Amino acid sequence: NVFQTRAGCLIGAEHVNNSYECDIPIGAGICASYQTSQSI
């Protein structure tokens, strides 16, 4: 689940294509949340 952003390399969270009111600010317009199995 390696993902590349402009704030750094993120390991442990899968990348999606939707856009909601973001939960945890990562940076550079990228946020993260805990959703559904269960994952980040």
Binding site: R6, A7, G8, A28
Partner: protein, 48 residues
């Protein structure tokens, strides 16, 4: 709110400050000038 679809405001010219859909950013001419004036120092966010 989306930018106005038609431009008949009555003679007033807003193309100077409205965004131009010609560059990968939505910055107008004034915004581009203002960005070009001040220079940053962090040099991006990635330095391996």
């Amino acid at each position: 709110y989306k930018t106005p679809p038609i431009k008949d405001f009555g003679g007033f010219n807003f193309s100077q400050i409205l965004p131009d859909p010609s560059k990968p950013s939505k910055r107008s001419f004034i915004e581009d000038l203002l960005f070009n004036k001040v220079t940053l120092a962090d040099a991006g966010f990635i330095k391996q």
